[PDB]
Amino acid sequence: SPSLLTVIIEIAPKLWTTFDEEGNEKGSIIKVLEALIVFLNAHLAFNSANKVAVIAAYSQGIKYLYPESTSALXXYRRFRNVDETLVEEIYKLFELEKKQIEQNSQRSTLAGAMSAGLTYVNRISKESVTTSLKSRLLVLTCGSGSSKDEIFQYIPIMNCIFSATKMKCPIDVVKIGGSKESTFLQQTTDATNGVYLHVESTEGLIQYLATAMFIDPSLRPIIVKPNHGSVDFRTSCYLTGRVVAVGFICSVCLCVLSIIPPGNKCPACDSQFDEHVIAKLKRK
């Protein structure tokens, strides 16, 4: 059962800047690259030549890291070439970093990279009808702050959720960041069947790597290792911002709101609601 390893490791020199900034400057994410390179060699060994891939998110975009986009136009001899290719790629992307790169700090291109990974996976799986891969992915984040909960990218994150679920794809996660449970990714792995890795920085991750993210490719009979509970009291009222439990859900807009509603024209969609219906709501 050959399987595909699609590791998603973000590299924001902002997130990496936090990575060094948290704790000491005793070891850069270079260690993370190393542990990942070793782990990729491991997964490649694991099966009889089972394919893999990796992409990462710039401050201003993304690029296929393993695949070696059309550019011309040791150990097994092949772990060498894959990793070395990768190293040239990542450093050359490190040329793609400067003040203009230090400008594009509006969004987080995690979701788009995730989707494109799913897309290329499907491009194989639909292209690879013969030798059907039983594939899955991994997420990596040198976690940081300065944007407590970026909510903009949450929707297509859910869309990727369903994309994998229908595509029947395990998706495990390793966030390496401050003591913040990424409920987005938390419930993502939760439903879409991954394993939650909220870790600290300087530990040699190799152990967690080889342990927690070898389950799926064909197996999944083992006790999963999630974090503590995965409550589904979901995103807050769009107006209030405090996490909401008993739904006050607006309309075809589906703006999720609190006991607030302005009596009309929910503060996401310009669409009125019968004020007598508002009396029916406040009949509580």
Partner 1 sequence: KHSVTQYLEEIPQQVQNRLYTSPATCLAIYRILPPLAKFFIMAMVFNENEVPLLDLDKWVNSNGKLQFQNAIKSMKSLHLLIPNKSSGTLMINLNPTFKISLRNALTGGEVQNSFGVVVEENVVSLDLLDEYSANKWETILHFMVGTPLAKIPSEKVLNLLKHSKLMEEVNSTGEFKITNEGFQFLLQEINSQLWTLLLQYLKMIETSKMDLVDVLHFIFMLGALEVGKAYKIDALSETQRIMLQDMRDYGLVFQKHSNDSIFYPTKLALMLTSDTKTIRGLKNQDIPDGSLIVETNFKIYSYSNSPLQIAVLSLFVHLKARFVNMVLGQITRESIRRALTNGITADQIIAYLETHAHPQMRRLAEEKLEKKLELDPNCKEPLQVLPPTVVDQIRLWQLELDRVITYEGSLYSDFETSQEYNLLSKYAQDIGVLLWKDDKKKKFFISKEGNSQVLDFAKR
Partner 2 sequence: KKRTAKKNITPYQRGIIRSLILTLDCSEAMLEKDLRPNRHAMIIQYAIDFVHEFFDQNPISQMGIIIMRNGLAQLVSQVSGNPQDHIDALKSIRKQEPKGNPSLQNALEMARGLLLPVPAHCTREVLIVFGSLSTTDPGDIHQTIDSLVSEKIRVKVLGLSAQVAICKELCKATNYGDESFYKILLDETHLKELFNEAVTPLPVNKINKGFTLVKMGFPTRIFEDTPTFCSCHSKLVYGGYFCPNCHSKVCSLPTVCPCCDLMLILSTHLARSYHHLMPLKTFAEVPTTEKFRSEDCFSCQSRFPXXXXXXXXXXXXXSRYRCEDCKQEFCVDCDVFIHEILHNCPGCESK
Q: Which residues contact partner 1 (rule: CB under 8 A)?
A: 1, 38, 41-42, 45-46, 48-49, 74-77, 206-207, 210-211, 214, 218-219, 221-223
Q: List b or e across 73-108, with b for residues whose CB sees 16 or more CB atoms inside 10 angstroms.
A: eeeeeebeebbeebeebbeebeeeeeeebeeeeeeb
Q: Closer to partner 2 by CB, 35 or 255: give it.
A: 255
Residue 156 touches which member of Zn ion, partner 1, partner 2, none, C-beta under 5-8 Å by kind? partner 2
Give the strands of the sheet with 171-176, arranged side by side.
Answer: 61-64, 52-58, 5-9, 136-142, 171-176, 196-199
The distance of closest approach from Cβ of residue 20 to partner 2 in the complex, given in angstroms and rounded to an integer, is 27
Residue 223 touches which member of partner 1, partner 2, Zn ion, none, C-beta under 5-8 Å by kind? partner 1
The answer to whether 67 contacts partner 2 (rule: CB under 8 A) is: yes
Cβ 141 vs Cβ 32: under 8 Å: no
The answer to whether 274 contacts partner 2 (rule: CB under 8 A) is: yes
The answer to whether 257 contacts Zn ion (rule: CB under 5 A) is: no
For Zn ion (CB under 5 A), the number of binding residues is 7
Q: Closer to partner 1 by CB, 219 or 279: give it.
A: 219
Q: Closer to partner 1 by CB, 219 or 243: give it.
A: 219
Q: Closer to partner 1 by CB, 210 or 278: give it.
A: 210
Alpha-carbon torsion angle 11, 171, 182, 43, nearest 10:
-50
Cross-strand pairs, 199? 176
Q: Closer to Zn ion by CB, 30 or 73: give it.
A: 73
The distance of closest approach from Cβ of residue 57 to partner 2 in the complex, given in angstroms and rounded to an integer, is 9
Cross-strand pairs, 174? 140, 197
The distance of closest approach from Cβ of residue 154 to partner 1 in the complex, given in angstroms and rounded to an integer, is 33
Helices 30-46 and 78-95 cross at an angle (nearest 10°) of 150
| Token digits of residue 228 | 């503590």
61 φψ region: left (φ > 0), alpha (ψ -120 to 50), beta (else): left
Q: Which of 268, 273, 278, 281 binds Zn ion (CB under 5 A)?
A: 268
- Residue nearest Zn ion, Cβ-based: 253
Nearest to 10 by CA among 83, 135, 152, 109: 109
Helices 110-127 and 154-167 cross at an angle (nearest 10°) of 20
Q: Closer to partner 2 by CB, 19 or 184: give it.
A: 184
| Token digits of residue 281 | 């709501």
Token look-up 């891969």 returns 133
Binding site for partner 2 (CB under 8 A): 61-62, 64, 67, 69-70, 73, 106-107, 109, 111-113, 115-116, 118-120, 122-123, 126-127, 153, 155-156, 158-163, 166-167, 191, 230-235, 245-252, 254, 256, 261, 271-274, 277, 281
In the complex, the residues that contact Zn ion under the rule CB under 5 A are: 250-251, 253, 255, 266, 268-269
